[PDB]
Design a protein around this ligand. Structure first.
Ligand SMILES: NS(=O)(=O)NCCNc1nonc1/C(=N/O)Nc1ccc(F)c(Br)c1
Ligand SMILES: [Zn+2]
Length: 257
């Protein structure tokens, strides 16, 4: 029922999900001049060498690549995090034009797209329990700008023609998510929420400072996806982003000066 259109988009979500107007909603604008460098923050540990990707799915909102999270194979540790967070899936948000598509903004700047790598805290045993905890989830957010092609994204782009419509899935084994990371792990962090229903307020956000570059041809292939199911009127999957939400009583911390 929820989506990104005039009649079902972000301004409507609070009716089914009242936490949409909560105290720790995401995304937010990252004001680089009010974010506090926190020298007590540790380096982030991204340990993706043993990652086991499974499937790629058009879920009617985005496309997602799912991972085996039955063991510590692809984990995030350190930075602002206590303990070990397992990678469950990644997905993207993107625009109809190159000047919009990101959910987070940086000094009000919107990027062409944003990659979200979703992780859950292993002390809660499964993602369904983790979703109910204020420290249950950690999302690593990476901005996309249009420039040079990202070679590590091409295997994703090339399969999207096989998952054009809602509910379509395909095998997507042996994908290495290390190929989606920028050089630097410098980040901003703040407590927030999922940016899609159910908008659960259990996410530690880690947003990397350095965007990755993707080619115009790569992002054009995202924009050929459909929100609709096979047989329904064709509605291009574009502008599947939630805008910035009130910061309220929150501090954004930076890992870098
Ligand atoms: N745009 S965002 O903030 O990164 N949204 C991510 C939303 N997806 C998920 N968050 O955390 N588990 C997620 C996910 N991926 O397949 N499955 C999932 C599993 C169980 C549940 F009860 C719910 Br609700 C979602
Ligand atoms: Zn997301």
């Amino acid at each position: 029922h929820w989506g990104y259109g005039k009649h079902n988009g972000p301004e409507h979500w609070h009716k089914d999900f009242p936490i949409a107007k909560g105290e720790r909603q995401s995304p937010v604008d990252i004001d680089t001049h009010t974010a506090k460098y926190d020298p007590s923050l540790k380096p982030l540990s991204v340990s993706y060498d043993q990652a086991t990707s499974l499937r790629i799915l058009n879920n009617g909102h985005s496309f997602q690549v799912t991972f085996d999270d039955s063991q510590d194979k692809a984990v995030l540790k350190g930075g602002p995090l206590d303990g070990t967070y397992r990678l469950l899936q990644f997905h993207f948000h993107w625009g109809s034009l190159d000047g919009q598509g990101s959910e987070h903004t940086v000094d009000k700047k919107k990027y062409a797209a944003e990659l979200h790598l979703v992780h859950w805290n292993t002390k809660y045993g499964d993602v369904d329990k983790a979703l109910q905890q204020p420290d249950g989830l950690a999302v690593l957010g990476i901005f996309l700008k249009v420039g040079s092609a990202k070679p590590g994204l091409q295997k994703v782009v090339d399969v999207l023609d096989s998952i054009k419509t809602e509910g379509k899935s395909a095998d997507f084994t042996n994908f290495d998510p290390r190929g989606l990371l920028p050089e630097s792990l410098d980040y901003w962090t703040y407590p927030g929420s999922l940016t899609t229903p159910p908008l659960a307020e259990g996410v530690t956000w880690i947003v990397l400072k350095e965007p990755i570059s993707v080619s115009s041809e790569q992002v054009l292939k995202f924009r050929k996806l459909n929100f609709n199911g096979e047989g329904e009127p064709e509605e291009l999957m574009v502008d599947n982003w939630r805008p910035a939400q009130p910061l309220k009583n929150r501090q954004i911390k930076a890992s870098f000066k």
